[PDB]
Design a protein around this nucleic acid. Structure first.
Length: 102
RNA sequence: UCAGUU
């Protein structure tokens, strides 16, 4: 558990572990309590065009995300899913490769 | 379905 760019301000959160059929309205309905949401990115598969397994929630502000990204498992729709800072697939490669320990 | 075609 590194917290992807914890010192960095983020404006989109990653929703994983969604075993229940969760969509845009579900996520927004929960995360709106934290702050102003921009869009809910239900990231479909770029091959078949299906619910690939994960989604993102874009916020208009990077403070609204802070109350969220600090906690991992959030209960949305009634299911307790995993929420973390949504780092780009570009960044997630570099950040994972440069995973440092002391 | 736990990452935006890593």
């Amino acid at each position: 558990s590194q917290r992807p760019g914890a010192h960095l301000t983020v404006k989109k959160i990653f929703v994983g572990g969604i075993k229940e059929d969760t969509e845009e309205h579900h996520l927004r309905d929960y995360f709106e309590q934290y702050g102003k949401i921009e869009v809910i990115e239900i990231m479909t598969d770029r091959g078949s065009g299906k619910k690939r397994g994960f989604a993102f929630v874009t916020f208009d502000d990077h403070d609204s995300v802070d109350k969220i990204v600090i906690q991992k498992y959030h209960t949305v729709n009634g299911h307790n899913c995993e929420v973390r800072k949504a780092l780009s697939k570009q960044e997630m490669a570099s950040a994972s490769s440069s995973q440092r320990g002391r």
